[PDB]
Amino acid sequence: VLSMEDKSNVKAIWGKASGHLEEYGAEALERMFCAYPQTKIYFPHFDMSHNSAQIRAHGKKVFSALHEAVNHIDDLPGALCRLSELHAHSLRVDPVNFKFLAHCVLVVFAIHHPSALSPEIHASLDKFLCAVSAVLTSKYR
Amino acid sequence: VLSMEDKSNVKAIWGKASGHLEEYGAEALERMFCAYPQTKIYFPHFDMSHNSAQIRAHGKKVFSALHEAVNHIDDLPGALCRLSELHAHSLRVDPVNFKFLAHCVLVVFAIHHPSALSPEIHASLDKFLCAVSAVLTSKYR
Amino acid sequence: ASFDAHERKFIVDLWAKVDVAQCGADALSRMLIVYPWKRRYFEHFGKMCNAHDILHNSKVQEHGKKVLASFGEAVKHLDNIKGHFANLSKLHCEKFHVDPENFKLLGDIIIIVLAAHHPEDFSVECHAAFQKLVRQVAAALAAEYH
Amino acid sequence: ASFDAHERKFIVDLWAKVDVAQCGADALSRMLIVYPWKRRYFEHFGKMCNAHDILHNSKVQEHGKKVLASFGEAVKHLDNIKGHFANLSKLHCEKFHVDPENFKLLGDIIIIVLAAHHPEDFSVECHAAFQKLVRQVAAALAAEYH
Ligand code: HEM
Ligand code: HEM
Ligand code: HEM
Ligand code: HEM
């Protein structure tokens, strides 16, 4: 469960990514494909070159979805309902993969906002990304 | 999320344990202490002999709590609120341990009710025990 | 660790009573029903939309026989489990692309299948000897992952 | 796998710029704040009720220095990580009783600490070389668990 303090912490750190959703999202995907190359099997059709149009476009959708989740942090199951059906039922993504992407998102915030991602903010943002991941692996059938 | 079919499956299999809460709970603890000996560090004060009074008494409390969770399967966060504070905040039990006990509960139902624990019932009961475990590791602070 | 003489007796005496074809078919079917993302790795075996499809799929049934026969070779190489499974570790990593956390989940489903088929034999101490075997086989199948 | 020459250059060049005492104190503090159950393993270091207590605990600060200095010996034994860490694996298993899943969580927190302290250096390829190191050290610390 995310507390009131966690919810304010997540909103504050997420506001730093305003204006940067495509850039930060592209970087988070590029770091996941490089550091965890086993995730590339989900994206056989992608050009995996640096700043490819497919990776920038996909990165922007991922971060846009996270941005909507931050705005609806009191009801993540409702905000992420369609995406949970896509990942769990249609794509059958192995749940271990949500941990790899959540880690690459934290690394992107540590690089761009190192002082803003203090130990308490890190704890809140880690709690938020686990909560998102739990909604996205909730519909396997 | 547990479906309507999952909820009926969990109620049906749990009804087999009626009358046996102390026995099945004692067996689930004895199997966790033997198969996963690292869990014994939480219970330094216990007599670890077979059918010890402490293990029978503790087993009965665990299964009684699970029995109440089955009866309140639509609101597990509310039914298990006090127990989540005890395990996460007061005892600081490492979350890996909830998987060991959930596995030992399934083994106890496979031994006593092998035909009742069919593949679809197994899937429902595994989903219920993950849901219980998720409420009990939700309050680490 | 090494298996002691009591753990070995438990494992050898029980394995001799196991119907490997039946238990293997059951175990593979249960893992695809209980952990549905695992169906992606096997999508060449056909459609696996639901438990009914999985229980009636002859390819799933035949593959589960081979997997538990392979697992049962551990019982004859208890001193050398990592070395016996190194090629199969490589094959899972490179050809099948299976995430190594999944090996622990199938080991937990084999314990359940054995418990249900041999309840009088699957004592507290017998279970503990088998929990150590499945933990070592799952580790050996994860070992050539690079 | 073995580290190739490009992975080695990334790891060696970056480690030479790391303030190990500062990074180690930061990493240990963050793991107790982000994963609060880990406080149980250290309950002899004092009360760790909240992040303020943890950030001002001199024992936590000094221990984190030793842990990252120890981790940094991997950089000089890239060919022999499992063998270099076998005693420390035994000590964690038998004396400290630490569950081996926790080693992966501290490796992920070291990546974050390095990323924040060295952002221009922690390129996509540098991160991937360090992700392979922390995965091997975490595996070496889990290896003498029996
Ligand atoms: C924070 C976690 C995640 C979020 C918020 C997220 C979000 C999204 C969104 C918004 C889409 C686009 C859907 C649409 O266009 O309607 C998508 C598609 C997809 N996602 Fe994710 N995702 C996440 C994690 C992952 C992970 C871990 C994987 C696999 C490693 C993955 C694999 C895919 C794939 C393969 C597609 C389809 C892409 C295509 O067809 O071009 N996602 N995701
Ligand atoms: C299904 C999961 C679990 C349930 C439903 C459960 C339930 C309970 C209950 C009902 C109590 C008694 C509280 C009271 O008397 O007010 C208790 C105490 C406790 N539980 Fe659990 N528990 C679970 C899992 C675990 C696990 C995984 C561990 C550690 C490996 C654990 C360690 C303890 C300990 C150490 C106590 C205190 C015992 C004492 O002081 O004698 N529990 N639990
Ligand atoms: C006890 C653990 C395991 C054992 C002993 C085992 C053994 C085997 C064997 C013997 C084969 C046949 C190799 C060949 O000659 O081509 C195989 C294939 C395969 N295994 Fe496993 N396996 C295990 C666990 C798993 C798990 C957990 C997964 C995925 C969730 C998996 C996925 C596969 C796949 C996808 C194939 C290829 C199927 C085919 O093309 O016929 N295995 N395994
Ligand atoms: C990168 C991973 C790790 C390394 C390199 C490492 C290294 C060390 C070292 C060098 C010591 C001192 C040994 C001695 O001379 O007594 C130690 C002690 C200890 N470590 Fe770790 N460690 C790691 C991960 C962890 C994790 C994840 C935990 C628990 C969450 C943990 C818990 C402990 C505990 C409880 C002690 C004893 C503390 C004391 O009594 O001073 N370690 N570790």
Residue numbers in the entry:
A (entry chain A), B (entry chain A): 1 to 141
C (entry chain B), D (entry chain B): 1 to 146
Q: What does the publication say?
A:
Hemoglobins (Hbs) from all jawed vertebrates form similar hetero-tetramers, with two *α* and two *β* subunits. Hb is present at enormous concentration within the red blood cell, over 300 mg/mL in the case of humans for example, to facilitate oxygen transport around the body. The change between these two quaternary structures of Hb can be described approximately as a rigid rotation of one *αβ* dimer relative to the other by about 15°, giving a different pattern of hydrogen bond interactions between the subunits. The MWC model explains the cooperative binding of oxygen by low affinity of the T state, which is stabilized by intersubunit bonds that oppose oxygen binding, so that the less contrained R state shows higher ligand affinity and is preferred at higher oxygen saturation.
CO-bound crocodile Hb showed the R conformation and, unexpectedly, a smaller population of molecules in a T-like conformation. A map with resolution 2.33 Å was obtained from 434,265 particles, and the refined model shows a dimer rotation angle of 15.1°. Bonds characteristic of the R conformation (such as between Asp *α*_1_94 and Asn *β*_2_102) are found in the new HbAM R model, but not in the T-like conformation. In the HbAM R model, Asp *α*94 also interacts with Tyr *β*41, a residue unique to crocodilian Hbs ([Fig fig3]). The amino acid substitution Glu *β*39 → Arg, unique to crocodilian Hbs, appears to favour the R conformation over R2. Arg *β*39, associated with the bicarbonate binding effect of crocodilian Hbs, appears to be largely responsible for the preference of liganded HbAM to adopt the R conformation. In the case of crocodilian Hb, the R2 conformation is absent, and residue changes around the bicarbonate binding site strongly favour the R conformation over R2. This provides clear proof that the allosteric mechanism of Hb does not rely on the R2 conformation, merely breakage of intersubunit bonds specific to the T-state.
